[PDB]
Amino acid sequence: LGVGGLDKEFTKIFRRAFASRIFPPSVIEKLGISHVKGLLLYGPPGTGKTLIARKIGTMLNAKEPKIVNGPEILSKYVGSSEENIRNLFKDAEAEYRAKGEESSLHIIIFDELDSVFKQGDNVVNQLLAKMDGVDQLNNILVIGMTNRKDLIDSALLRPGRFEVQVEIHLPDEKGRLQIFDIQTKKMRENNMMSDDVNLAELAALTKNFSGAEIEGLVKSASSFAINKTVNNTKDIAKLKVTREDFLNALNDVTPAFGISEEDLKTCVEGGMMLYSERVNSILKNGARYVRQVRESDKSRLVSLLIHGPAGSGKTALAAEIALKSGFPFIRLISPNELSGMSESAKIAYIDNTFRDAYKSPLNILVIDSLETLVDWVPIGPRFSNNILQMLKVALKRKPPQDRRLLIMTTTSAYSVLQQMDILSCFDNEIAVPNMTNLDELNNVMIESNFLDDAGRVKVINELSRSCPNFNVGIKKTLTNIETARHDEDPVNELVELMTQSA
Amino acid sequence: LGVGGLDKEFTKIFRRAFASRIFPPSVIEKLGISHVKGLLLYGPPGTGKTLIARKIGTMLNAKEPKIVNGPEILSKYVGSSEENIRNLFKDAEAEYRAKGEESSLHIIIFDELDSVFKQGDNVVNQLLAKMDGVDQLNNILVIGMTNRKDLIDSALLRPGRFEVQVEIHLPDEKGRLQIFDIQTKKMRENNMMSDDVNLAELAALTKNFSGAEIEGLVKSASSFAINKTVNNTKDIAKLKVTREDFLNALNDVTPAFGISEEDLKTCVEGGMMLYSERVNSILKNGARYVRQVRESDKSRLVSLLIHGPAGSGKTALAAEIALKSGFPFIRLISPNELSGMSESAKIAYIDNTFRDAYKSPLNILVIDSLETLVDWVPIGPRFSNNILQMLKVALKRKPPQDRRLLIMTTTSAYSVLQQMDILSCFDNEIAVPNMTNLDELNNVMIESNFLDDAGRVKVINELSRSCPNFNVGIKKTLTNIETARHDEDPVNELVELMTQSA
Ligand SMILES: Nc1ncnc2c1ncn2[C@@H]1O[C@H](COP(=O)(O)OP(=O)(O)OP(=O)(O)O)[C@@H](O)[C@H]1O
Ligand SMILES: Nc1ncnc2c1ncn2[C@@H]1O[C@H](COP(=O)(O)OP(=O)(O)OP(=O)(O)O)[C@@H](O)[C@H]1O
Ligand SMILES: Nc1ncnc2c1ncn2[C@@H]1O[C@H](COP(=O)(O)OP(=O)(O)O)[C@@H](O)[C@H]1O
Ligand SMILES: Nc1ncnc2c1ncn2[C@@H]1O[C@H](COP(=O)(O)OP(=O)(O)O)[C@@H](O)[C@H]1O
Ligand SMILES: [Mg+2]
Ligand SMILES: [Mg+2]
């Protein structure tokens, strides 16, 4: 017909909400039952709910369904809003007096239902009157659509009202293959599509898209081929789309439920060099855990705690372990995002991020500098307890319906966490130490191209008896080489800086 | 007549509210008494109150009852609501002036009465005027309905107003047997029901349903048999519902006052293995307490405390004991449900859960992580006292009218509870210890299919002289084997991890 990827949900809606309307009234009256009058559809935006609604009605040959938007009714003036509802059902009322039980079916779609409860009452009560009360109207069927089931009051779900509930999901590979078929049919049937375009490849590149995003991608590719000829010209009849156009268009549409590439890549990495054996061990353990949470069904929530002193490398490690994983979904919470908001806004932001992470097969989250998110200052001490409780609950909840995620977190204030007794949330702890021998300094000098061997040797020979057992980090070590490089006397300057830091 | 299960109740209502209306006016005048003008019915929703109201009306062949809804009147504009109440009684006023004492009876129904008091006064005063004051009308009888008696002000219950009060209950096995007949009459009497459907079985499976759920169950079963023909065809005349349809329909309707199966089963239990004698003792004691509660009338409340270190197994034991009991009603209160709410909302939620527990023959409740529900942080220390007092009162109250329930609660901060002085609530305490011997580790490895015994011997030998006094929980032990399994060198990795944890 038109819909794609939905094959166990088009059977289950049709079995219950619609099957009885086909038969003549005699047999339905014969058994002694009643038609259902409410159906609820829930799932993330852009996934095809309104489509199913409109498309089913063409089989029954009902009237074109009316549509009403929640916030519209809520933003109208009080009296106008009150009168509006009684306007909506007028045609349905008339036809019943006209033809009794043999009237046709009428469909009403109610969108963004949750908005009414998010605080209103008059709309809800008037609406329930028309399908539950003594003024019962036996022609109508009302469809509701929401992204959040938990905000609707339980009173509405009980038998007689919104009796059947269905859930829509993001598509998998076979779904996307069918959606591509549906969207490119009309191009294919008119010899306006090249022969190198292979749809099974695109089905695998577009990893976590919804249907709407696929519409947008096709439109973009068409755009390229149009622009290639304008400046409106002869020989339009030879127009065609090509594989290169799809590959170019893939760089202009970025999906929600994707990878926050720029923040991870640029902000958190400006080098990476293996200067010791501990580093290598840390990156191997990271790979082990990524593999564990992709090939086992008895581990759907792992949490880790990379601790260490300041200037030690922590965050750059977390990022490095994530970018090599290849998961579809990756995000991070850091102080840069929460700047300038009130406390309540912060709670809302964290909660929404976690809810968005429970809608893909695989997920990674990074939490950076746990103590700064809580506003810790030791003169008081002062901190925010509400945020702490939100985080403490979140780090132990398990995603529903055989999904899975991995979490990584970074801190420099281990003792404070020990004091706040939230140290049982973590499954394992990794330690990151500083540099403490001159061999590491030699390695770091070599891989940054500091200067020729003749000078390098002299730096080590002078520090050998200037300061034998220094204790410095990596972040500071790379800001001293960089500044010393620009001096007029590089060896002496570097020696002085190193001695001061140690 | 048309209703079943509610017999006794009837006998009474008819004895008091209506018996006087049958007799001729002369004898009633002759005794020197006056009719009753108010009747209150209360009980859980969907249990059959409005049905009784209508069906009694048909025996006395009075007019069709009028109906009004509380929220409807309360939400309307102030002036319209004030003018509205006077419209409702107009017809009754007219017939009185027409025909005096010999007028027929008028019956008015008022729904969701408590909504008026839950905060209003104008409707209450105007209503009492017509049935108590000087302007009394002697034709009317008013029926009220509420789910909550305790909220109604006492001024209404005194003689002359709402003089008779009655309660409706959820049916027992015999009642459900009757309700199935009343609902399936029209199918049975027209040869559209198979010869294998046995109603005594269905009455026994549907353990805690109300009437509305039974209507829904029949409707769903009809839907199965109907859909099996379409795609609208010939031989509609051979339609028949069958036993398999009922058994499959049983999985689509879930009742309130049922079992929260998914939450108990998936989240809280992902393995169970009897690695020591203490575990067997714990489970045996749980079974003891269960069948105690089922076979005694001198123990209608029992409360338990399970305590021990973090990671020891607690919550899984609790859920494991719940699943094998076989009770109809099971729920749990845990931090996940209360996340994101304000304080007042949390209190309301807890209180409603306890109220819903007091309406079934048998009940179990599970309360998880008592110290996290109160928001304890030891720096202050800071915590919420209101929630603590609510929980402290609730754990001692006994349910009414020969019902019984069992409570289990789990915690990791035994010293804190001792400081807060709420140990007096619990009847007995159970201790869950950690692992402390190598034999237990051997059993766990055998049970989890780690690797062939040849390698298994080596782990125990190496730990026998590396660290013989280790002290770790079961959760950590089951998350270290899992990660070691995926390594390239599984023995050394597991040995190192165990040494670190101890
Ligand atoms: N082997 C390495 N491991 C980690 N970081 C490295 C390595 N080699 C170079 N670097 C660079 O060193 C810097 C380390 O700074 P980074 O922000 O990761 O430290 P940090 O301890 O998280 O800092 P802070 O806690 O003060 O915010 C980064 O620019 C990183 O790219
Ligand atoms: N004999 C057993 N006893 C307890 N848990 C077991 C047993 N065998 C396997 N398990 C598994 O071990 C895990 C125990 O974790 P659980 O959440 O019950 O611990 P907990 O004491 O509640 O932890 P926490 O204090 O961190 O909340 C569960 O996944 C459970 O299925
Ligand atoms: N599963 C799907 N199969 C085919 N087309 C789809 C699908 N999902 C989305 N589309 C396309 O995207 C458009 C927008 O989807 P829409 O029905 O508005 O979803 P929502 O109800 O979430 O807004 C549809 O009109 C259709 O062209
Ligand atoms: N004891 C019963 N026997 C038969 N049918 C019942 C019974 N109780 C409830 N029902 C069915 O449930 C339907 C809904 O009940 P309703 O009249 O709304 O009662 P209430 O709303 O007061 O719970 C009724 O129309 C009736 O068909
Ligand atoms: Mg950092
Ligand atoms: Mg627990």
XYZ file of N, CA, C and O in Angstrom, chain A residues 48 83 88 99 148 150 154 218 265 274 296 346 379 389 455 457 477:
68
model
N 6.151 7.731 11.573
C 5.084 7.287 10.691
C 3.733 7.000 11.318
O 3.026 6.095 10.868
N -16.030 26.818 23.423
C -17.002 26.602 22.351
C -16.458 25.720 21.222
O -17.239 25.062 20.525
N -16.374 20.719 16.889
C -15.612 19.695 16.176
C -16.496 18.529 15.715
O -16.346 18.044 14.587
N -29.269 8.746 9.559
C -29.313 7.357 9.085
C -29.147 6.293 10.171
O -29.022 5.109 9.836
N 5.241 10.642 24.937
C 5.470 10.333 26.347
C 4.195 9.706 26.892
O 3.171 10.384 27.016
N 3.989 8.266 29.998
C 3.922 8.329 31.455
C 3.199 9.562 31.985
O 2.849 9.582 33.169
N -3.956 7.816 34.632
C -4.453 6.449 34.508
C -5.952 6.389 34.249
O -6.438 5.376 33.736
N 16.864 11.989 -0.033
C 16.506 11.930 -1.452
C 16.378 13.330 -2.046
O 16.907 13.616 -3.131
N 35.821 15.206 18.959
C 37.035 15.137 18.167
C 37.899 16.349 18.482
O 39.039 16.216 18.939
N 52.116 7.222 22.782
C 52.320 6.129 23.733
C 53.709 6.265 24.354
O 54.705 5.830 23.771
N 27.221 -10.192 24.145
C 26.755 -10.947 25.298
C 25.416 -10.392 25.761
O 25.154 -9.192 25.654
N 18.685 22.399 34.718
C 19.736 21.389 34.649
C 19.166 19.993 34.871
O 19.513 19.038 34.151
N 35.054 25.402 51.283
C 35.007 26.314 52.425
C 33.780 26.040 53.284
O 33.833 26.138 54.516
N 21.326 13.465 43.740
C 20.393 12.349 43.823
C 19.948 11.903 42.438
O 19.830 10.697 42.173
N 70.864 18.230 21.013
C 70.319 19.030 22.097
C 69.525 18.199 23.085
O 69.556 18.424 24.317
N 69.994 15.295 24.049
C 70.803 14.581 25.029
C 71.137 15.510 26.191
O 71.082 15.119 27.365
N 53.401 19.202 30.613
C 54.650 18.887 29.927
C 54.633 19.349 28.476
O 55.689 19.677 27.922
